[PDB]
From a paper:
Type I fungal FAS forms a barrel-shaped complex composed of two reaction chambers. Six β-chains form the walls of the barrel while a central wheel, made by the six α-chains, bisects the barrel into two chemically identical reaction chambers. Substrates are shuttled between the static reaction centers by the mobile ACP domain flexibly tethered at its N and C termini.
In both our activity assays and cryoEM samples, the FAS enzymes were pre-incubated with cerulenin prior to addition of substrates acetyl- and malonyl-CoA and NADPH to ensure KS site was inhibited prior to the start of the reaction (i.e. KS-stalled state). In our high-resolution cryoEM maps, we can see appearance of additional densities immediately above the catalytic cysteine of the KS-domain in the KS-stalled state suggesting covalent linkage between cerulenin and the KS catalytic residue, which confirms our activity assay demonstrating inhibition of catalysis at the ketoacyl synthesis step. Stalling catalysis at the KS domain drastically alters the ACP densities inside the reaction chamber of both fungal FASs, as judged by improved ACP density near KS domain and weakened ACP density by the AT- and ER-domains in S. cerevisiae and C. albicans FASs, respectively. With the ability to observe ACP at the ER and redirect this mobile domain to the KS, we focused on conformational differences within the ER catalytic region of C. albicans FAS. This site within C. albicans enzyme represented the most pronounced alteration in ACP localization upon stalling catalysis at the KS-domain. Weak density can be seen for the NADPH in proximity of FMN in the KS-stalled state, indicating partial/transient binding that does not clash with either of the histidine side chain conformations seen here.
Residue numbers in the entry:
A (entry chain B): 1190 to 2037
B (entry chain A): 1 to 93
C (entry chain B): 341 to 510
Write the structure that this text describes.
């Protein structure tokens, strides 16, 4: 076919017609060039008519990328965003595209019983005819032919669903950067792709009208600033910025630290003078209720400046809220040569799929006109290739894990070239993995693609330990090494000593056996009043809500009070569980400081880690409230049991291994055993811990029933007569008496020892040494109302951000994930017979 | 549910949940079977002084979720903050 | 069944070929088969374990399993739709075989193809795509010498067919 036509036109003018065929409709289109013939000079007989050249090139490219359908309209506003067009993502298009890029990721090939997924790189297919319309406007006038695609960047909106094969998808894109660099006219466009109105992902492309341009009038730039966090400590600082006429606060509230989220709008007048700067942004204040309220606005505006003063002032006087936390030493993901790819043979299959008919990649003649090495591969193809590479070599072929990918077309690749890439994990952000890549032309070793990808972590979950694992020196290495961790021990103890009169750090570090609180001068009295104010409830036989005192030993006369724990204060419940929640929250916060937390995490805690959990992941409470509730809980469950002269109880707790008794001893075995041994002796005995099936059960109750049971489990082991093995030997009722033939003989032994019976280790029973309160049992059910009061006044209702609790939180009361469905209220209320939840459950309709 | 309605609901529900947790048995076996089956979590990170739940999770895997992981080709990796410092911080030598 | 108890029937695993008594071939999605052999690696024992000193009935099962260099889930439901497409491509052309001369034993049923009421191609395709392979049942011969023209040779079907009919004098 004709690809080149040189012919005379109206006298003394040559029209070099450069023809291209493979178009949207395969209709051949001509690129009319004009050259003036000059017989007068021979040294230069023909000079090209340079006037109106860019327009001839532009209309050509317009017919190319859009087809002769839409009239070439060059009058595009730069300011307004450019609209795309609603397209239906069908399975055929997905298949063709995946084949054109050679992607094998099975999430995109149609499989039964699973939703057909589309590749994230399909957005450019969706958004090309919207993206490229941004380089057409008259103000950005340059050699369209020498255009070079510099860099591309994908970014899925946090929490956006990847594409399916039925999605009705539209595209909106706006142009951001038009700046005359020394190398040419850079143009950056960002495309916010939509799905039923909600934006799904953002694509940031980057072109370059190579050459030279001095149109410093039609150049500009819009950039959002990095959110900076400035901390105000002295009193001048608050006046320092209040002097700044560009700073303008609208709320007269005191503030300690302020986060500045700003954006700017530059307009240049020369290489470095800014004909205008309009930089508006918001200043934000972090309240202890974790609710962020804007204190005021930032409004700078000037002309012929040399820098943005607001940004500079933020830089030197404050640190940014940075997200890309970098390792000190990057790690190579895979080592060897297994990361090698190869360029295609022809770029036409990619062109017809991606709608990019750029004749640089398909025709020898254009590729020669731009003096570039030949029909180089489509840059977008080279992007998608490495993307599909890392999608399996970095995410183990899990498609939804990649959430953002950006790369820089450093070099060009001619077809069929063999490309080797390296793959490196360097940093972290928001809990997702930063992976840096370099694709070098393996036969020349020069780099071609330097990129960056944000892929998720494996589905993680965080559990938090309970009490019993305490020991001296918890995290003290971390406390001495992690600043952000030290800032929670220091934030907490200086709350204790100023409100309870002891340093938790000293308790954890040098665990003593006794602590003497002193109510000294003014602030000494200002502490013992706090102790006095602690009024807990234990429902007695009268049932009256007896707002009774915890410390009957503290009054208006007691000058000083002493705690004693023979084992060590670090073992006393009211002191240990604050230490545990502190060390756990310290570790969690130090980790979060490293951007190590995925967004889709599920969390839970074992009877104490629960508090250190919803305070950590859900931040329902600041540290100062958390320590108060955990200390108050320790004391409440402590004084809840009437003690002996030594402070000890007739109650206890025991851990059992239902496997060491007999292989036939199932979960139902020991729970039926506890049911019978507690229903006969009329004592209180419950299994409160369902830790491991048939390996770890922890039962609680009065020491009498606990020893009765630790003996029934010994005699059923030496006899190997299991209650389930009696189900085929006896009926359901005559086993209830069969165990009676045994349980009385050992109840006699339970009464045969001194009533505070020191539980001896059974055959498969390992008691809880150190504690004597049957927590998680119905015995403590009386003391809940005071704790429930304490909570609803220590937990600010406004701090509850429920979106992170639904499904991500697993309570220990109700092991199914926390979620506010009517059935969930039913399940919790039938388990606790509460009043507050059944009240709202009755009038449930007040939900929608 | 309006954000204010569900906030009231969530607040009251959480308050009562914690309050009665204090005196109701911890249902940790089924909690493990939730966060291992209903979610199929790969990395289980325990934070505390000692891996009391890591040992509490390895046994659950070896007891009830071996055929399930093999059927699904899941390589569950348990990690505790006590010993697995280099592995949780993704900066392991 | 242990493996399929965890998966839907679109990842279900089924017996594909029966190459003999203790020579079977499974078919299914490669990741599912991978998990299956993962179970096996647990229930199995290493080859050099020396169970000589432990009595017979309580010995650990020993096997040898590895994927065959095949790239299609042959003889399964996984290709059940391809059957109609292939026979449609047949109808597209004049693809058919006339009356046979030597009796050809069916692979799944074990019957003769000369006794076919259908054409043969429509039968052989459903025989390759969906139906399993009962080899020794299909090669229930009355035969003295056997010639394999298939691939592999020393690693081909010939060796396992030999081991199947070791004492029958072929």
């Amino acid at each position: 076919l004709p690809v080149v036509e040189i012919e005379l036109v109206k006298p003394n003018t040559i029209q070099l017609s450069l023809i291209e065929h493979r178009t949207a409709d395969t209709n051949p289109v001509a690129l009319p060039f004009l050259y003036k013939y000059n017989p007068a000079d021979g040294f230069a007989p023909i000079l090209e008519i340079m006037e109106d050249r860019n327009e001839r090139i532009k209309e050509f490219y317009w017919k190319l990328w859009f087809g002769s359908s839409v009239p070439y309209s060059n009058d595009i506003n730069v300011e307004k965003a450019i609209l795309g067009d609603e397209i239906t993502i069908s399975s055929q298009t997905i298949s063709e595209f995946t084949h054109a890029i050679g992607n094998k990721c099975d999430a995109f090939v149609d499989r039964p019983g699973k939703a057909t997924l589309a590749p994230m790189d399909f957005a450019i297919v969706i958004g090309w005819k919207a993206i490229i319309k941004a380089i057409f406007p008259k103000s950005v006038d340059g050699d369209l032919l020498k255009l070079v695609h510099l860099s591309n960047g994908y970014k899925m909106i946090t929490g956006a669903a990847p594409l399916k094969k039925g999605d009705v998808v539209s595209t909106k894109a706006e142009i951001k950067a038009v700046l005359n660099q020394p190398s040419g006219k850079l143009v950056e466009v960002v495309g916010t792709i939509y799905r039923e109105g909600k934006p799904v992902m953002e694509v940031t492309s980057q072109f370059l009208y190579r050459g030279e341009y001095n149109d410093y009038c039609n150049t500009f730039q819009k950039v959002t600033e990095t959110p900076v966090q400035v901390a105000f400590k002295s009193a001048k600082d608050l006046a320092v910025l209040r002097s700044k006429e560009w700073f303008h606060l609208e709320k007269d509230v005191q503030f300690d630290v302020l986060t500045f989220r700003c954006e700017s709008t530059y307009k240049f007048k020369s290489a470095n003078v800014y004909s205008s700067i309009k930089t508006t942004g918001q200043v934000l204040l972090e309240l202890p209720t974790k609710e962020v309220i804007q204190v005021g606005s930032v409004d700078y505006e000037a002309g012929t400046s040399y820098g943005n003063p607001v940004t500079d002032y933020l830089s030197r006087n404050g640190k940014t809220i940075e997200e890309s936390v970098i390792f000190e030493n990057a790690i190579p993901l895979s080592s060897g040569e297994e990361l090698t790819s190869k360029a295609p043979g022809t770029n036409e299959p990619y062109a017809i799929v991606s709608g990019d008919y750029n004749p640089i990649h398909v025709s020898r003649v254009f590729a020669a006109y731009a003096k570039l090495p030949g029909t180089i591969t489509h840059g977008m193809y080279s992007s998608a290739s490495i993307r599909a590479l890392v999608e399996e070599w970095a995410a183990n072929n899990v498609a939804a894990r990649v959430r953002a990918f950006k790369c820089d077309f450093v070099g060009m690749v001619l077809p069929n070239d063999t490309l080797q890439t390296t793959m490196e994990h360097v940093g972290m952000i928001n809990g997702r993995k930063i992976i840096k890549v370099e694709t070098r032309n393996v036969e020349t070793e020069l780099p071609v693609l330097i990129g960056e990808a944000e892929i998720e972590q494996p589905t993680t979950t965080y559990v938090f330990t309970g009490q019993g694992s305490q020991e001296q020196g918890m995290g003290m290495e971390l406390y001495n090494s992690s600043e952000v961790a030290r800032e929670v021990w220091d934030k907490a103890d200086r709350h204790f000593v100023n409100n309870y009169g002891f340093s938790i750090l000293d308790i954890v570090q040098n665990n003593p056996n006794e602590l003497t609180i002193h109510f000294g001068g003014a602030k000494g009295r200002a502490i013992r009043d706090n102790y006095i104010g602690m009024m807990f409830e234990t429902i007695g036989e009268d049932g009256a809500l007896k707002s009774e005192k915890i410390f009957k030993d503290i009054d208006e006369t007691t000058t000083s009070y002493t705690f004693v724990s023979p084992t060590g204060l670090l073992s006393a419940t009211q002191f240990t569980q604050p230490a545990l929640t502190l060390m756990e929250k310290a570790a969690y916060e130090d980790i979060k400081s490293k951007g190590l937390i995925p967004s889709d995490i599920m969390f839970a805690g074992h009877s104490l880690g629960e508090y250190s959990a919803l305070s950590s992941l859900a931040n329902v409470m600041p540290i100062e409230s958390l320590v108060d509730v955990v200390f108050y809980r320790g004391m409440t469950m402590q004084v809840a049991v009437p003690r002996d002269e030594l402070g000890r109880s007739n109650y206890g707790m025991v851990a059992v291994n239902p496997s060491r008794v007999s292989a036939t001893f199932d979960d139902s075995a020991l729970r039926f055993v506890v049911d019978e041994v507690a229903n006969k002796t009329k004592w209180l005995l419950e299994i409160v811990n369902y830790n491991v099936e048939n390996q770890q059960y922890v039962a609680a109750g009065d020491l009498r029933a606990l020893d009765t049971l630790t003996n029934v489990l010994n005699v059923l082991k030496i006899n190997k007569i299991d209650i389930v093995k009696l189900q085929e030997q006896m009926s359901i009722e005559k086993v209830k008496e069969h165990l009676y033939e045994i349980v009385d003989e050992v109840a006699a032994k339970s009464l045969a020892k001194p009533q505070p019976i020191d539980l001896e280790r059974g055959f498969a029973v390992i008691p809880l040494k150190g504690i004597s309160v049957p927590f998680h049992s119905s015995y403590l059910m009386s003391g809940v109302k005071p704790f429930q009061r304490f909570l609803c006044k220590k937990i600010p209702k406004s701090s509850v951000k429920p979106q992170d609790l639904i499904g991500k939180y697993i309570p220990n009361l109700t092991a199914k994930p926390f979620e506010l469905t009517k059935e969930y209220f039913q399940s919790v209320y039938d388990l606790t017979k509460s009043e507050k939840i059944k009240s709202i459950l009755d009038n449930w309709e007040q939900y929608e | 549910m309006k954000p204010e309605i569900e906030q009231e609901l969530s607040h009251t529900l959480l308050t009562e949940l914690l309050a009665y947790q204090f005196a109701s048995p911890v249902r940790w076996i089924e909690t493990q079977d939730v966060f291992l089956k209903q979610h199929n979590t790969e990395r289980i990170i325990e934070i505390g002084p000692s891996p009391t739940l890591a040992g509490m999770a390895n046994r659950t895997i070896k007891a009830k979720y071996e055929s399930y992981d093999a059927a699904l080709s899941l390589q569950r990796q348990v990690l505790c903050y006590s010993k697995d410092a280099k592995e949780i911080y993704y900066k392991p030598d | 069944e242990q493996t399929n108890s965890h998966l839907p029937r679109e990842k279900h695993i089924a017996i594909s070929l029966i190459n003999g008594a203790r020579n079977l071939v499974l078919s299914g999605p490669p990741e599912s088969l991978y998990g299956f052999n993962l179970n096996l690696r647990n229930q199995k024992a290493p080859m050099g374990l020396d169970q000589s000193r432990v009595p017979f009935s309580e010995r650990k099962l020993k096997c040898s399993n590895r994927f065959l260099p095949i790239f299609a889930p042959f003889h399964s439901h996984l290709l059940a739709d391809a059957t109609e497409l292939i026979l449609d491509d047949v109808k597209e052309h004049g693809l058919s075989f006339e009356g046979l001369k030597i009796p050809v034993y069916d692979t799944f049923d074990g019957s003769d193809f000369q006794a076919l009421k259908e054409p043969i191609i429509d039968r052989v395709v459903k025989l390759i795509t969906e139906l399993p392979v009962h080899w020794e049942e299909a090669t229930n011969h009355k035969a003295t010498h056997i010639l394999d023209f298939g691939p592999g040779g020393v690693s081909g079907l010939g060796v396992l067919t030999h081991r199947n009919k070791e004492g029958t004098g072929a």
